[model samples]
Target: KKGVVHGVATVAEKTKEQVTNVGGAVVTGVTAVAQKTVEGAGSIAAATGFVKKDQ
Candidate 1:
């Protein structure tokens, strides 16, 4: 559960950083991928009842 929560926070932080801190299109794309990965992890955690949606 602790690790799952950390993943959720990391996903959000990276997404926001990309939105505001990206240096170029490439960086933005990388962040987009980061966002997707985090969201996927979050989904798995949610599916397992380890975390809740609307977090």
Candidate 2:
């Protein structure tokens, strides 16, 4: 779980860096936004047990 959090943090940082290069906000402000998105996705996957429950 901690590793997942760290991974999310790393990627969120990278995403903010990329976005900033294109004239966007820094990682601190954007990390939670990105993390929530990733967490939502992860939640869906976990809930579905990594299987396709629907089309």
Candidate 3:
């Protein structure tokens, strides 16, 4: 088992760009944490064989 990056990647990517555009601590902190959390969750799931990341 692996993990899915669909929604997570989308949110992370979009907010990431928005943060870049806005250049603020509020959005940056939130979105950056979101991006890292999503990516990190994927990694954890992959390691734990929780989800199917193959697709």
Candidate 4:
């Protein structure tokens, strides 16, 4: 998941920059992680039979 990790790092950098101007930017960063994290999480869940896999 290098793509996911790289995306997270980029978001962190942006969050750091925007944190001073807008404290709420932290949620933006977290929401980005949550949305992307679930993409990978769902794959694992399906593999483990925790969730149904799409046909």
lDDT of each: 0.34, 0.35, 0.35, 0.35
Per TM-score, the best of the predicted structures is: 4
**Per-prediction backbone clash count:** 0, 0, 1, 0
Q: Which ten residues in a row have the lowest lDDT in candidate 2?
A: 28-37
Task: For candidate 3, write residues 1-55 as lDDT tens digits.
Answer: 5557643233343352542222223323322223333444334522321334465
Off by over 4 Å in 3: 1-4, 11-16, 19-26, 29-55
Taking every candidate in turn, the Cα RMSD to the unseen true structure, in Å, is: 15.9, 16.1, 16.5, 15.4
Q: Write the per-residue lDDT of candidate 1 for residues 1-55, one digit (tens) a residue.
A: 2445522133443344433322222233322222333445334532211323464
Which stretches in model 2 have alpha-carbon errors above 4 Å?
1-20, 28-55
Q: What is the TM-score of candidate 4?
A: 0.12
lDDT of 3 at 7: 36
lDDT of 4 by residue, 1-55 (tens): 2345522243443344443332222333422223333455335522211334469
Query: What ordering of candidates by TM-score runs from best to worst?
Result: 4, 1, 2, 3
Question: What is the alpha-carbon lDDT of model 3 when measured against the actual structure?
Answer: 0.35
Could you give candidate 2's per-residue lDDT for residues 1-55 as a string of tens digits? Answer: 2345522233443343432233232443322222333445345432311335355
Q: What TM-score number comes out for model 3?
A: 0.11
